[PDB]
UniProtKB/Swiss-Prot annotation:
Localization terms from the record: Cell membrane; Early endosome membrane; Melanosome; Cytoplasmic vesicle
Result for mutant: Y75A: Strongly decreases RABEP1 binding affinity
Domain notes: Switch 1, switch 2 and the interswitch regions are characteristic of Rab GTPases and mediate the interactions with Rab downstream effectors. The switch regions undergo conformational changes upon nucleotide binding which drive interaction with specific sets of effector proteins, with most effectors only binding to GTP-bound Rab.
Top enzyme category: hydrolase
Protein name according to UniProt: Ras-related protein Rab-5A
Glycosylation site list: R106
Residues the entry annotates as binding GTP: 15-16, 18-21, 32-33, 38, 64, 119-120, 122, 150-151
Quaternary structure note: Interacts with SGSM1 and SGSM3. Interacts with PIK3CB. Interacts with GDI1; this promotes dissociation from membranes; phosphorylation at Ser-70 disrupts this interaction. Interacts with GDI2; phosphorylation at Ser-70 disrupts the interaction. Interacts with EEA1. Interacts with RIN1 and GAPVD1, which regulate its pathway, probably by acting as a GEF. Interacts with RINL. Interacts with ALS2CL, SUN2, ZFYVE20 and RUFY1. Interacts with RABEP1; one RABEP1 homodimer binds two RAB5A chains, but at opposite sides of the dimer. Interacts with OCRL. Interacts with INPP5F.
Primary location recorded for the protein, binned into one broad class: membrane
Family stated for the protein in its record: Belongs to the small GTPase superfamily. Rab family.
Signal peptide range: none
Range of the intact protein held here: 15 to 181 of 215
A GO BP entry: positive regulation of exocytosis
Length: 167
């Protein structure tokens, strides 16, 4: 196809859940076991092929530490999509993700597409958030949900592509 589309995506979530790793895996195909916490935000882009359409992603990888919370609107205000990420081995990170979802539903564009990533799924031997419970929560709140692993690549390209398909 010769059609070209571009859209803005923002990643939000508690510090250390794997936002930067998810983006690096999708954009550069890399995974770093020692990834430093993000300061403010980082920007990356990736272009993919989706049904006769070339889709370019402009990605804002936000720093998740609470001291950067007041900067979030600068990154999500014009976003067409968001991926709120939690760590499947940390229930508190899942609760934090729900609060990010609430903030997006109240303050971001009313037409924003929101995905929920249950990341670090490769650590299921330390699971703290039940898959079905998270799926039910996502279904009830109209969120595109997938468990992912930046470490193994499981569902990484899939969640980004699923979002592009629903834009
Ligand atoms: N086992 C595993 N470790 C992961 C996964 N994704 C990220 N990690 C690890 O988790 C740690 C934090 O990841 P990072 O991407 O920096 O998290 P973040 O959400 O960007 N943190 P911040 O918001 O502070 O910038 C790193 O040690 C990274 O290697 C995953 O899918 N599986
Ligand atoms: Mg980061």
């Amino acid at each position: 196809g010769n059609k070209i589309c571009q859209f803005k995506l923002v990643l939000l979530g508690e510090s250390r859940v794997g936002k930067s790793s998810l983006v690096l895996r999708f954009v550069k195909g890399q995974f770093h076991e020692f990834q430093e916490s993000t300061i403010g935000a980082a920007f990356l882009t990736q272009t993919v092929c989706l049904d006769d359409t070339t889709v370019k992603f402009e990605i804002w990888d936000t720093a998740g530490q609470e001291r950067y919370h007041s900067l979030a609107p600068m990154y999500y205000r014009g976003a067409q999509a968001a991926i709120v990420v939690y760590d499947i081995t940390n229930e508190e990170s899942f609760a934090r993700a729900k609060n990010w979802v609430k903030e997006l539903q109240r303050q971001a564009s009313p037409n924003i597409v929101i995905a929920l990533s249950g990341n670090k799924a490769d650590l299921a031997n330390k699971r703290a958030v039940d898959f079905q419970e998270a799926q039910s929560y996502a279904d009830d709140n109209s969120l595109l949900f997938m468990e992912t692993s930046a470490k193994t690549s499981m569902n990484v390209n899939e969640i980004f592509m699923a979002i592009a398909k629903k834009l």
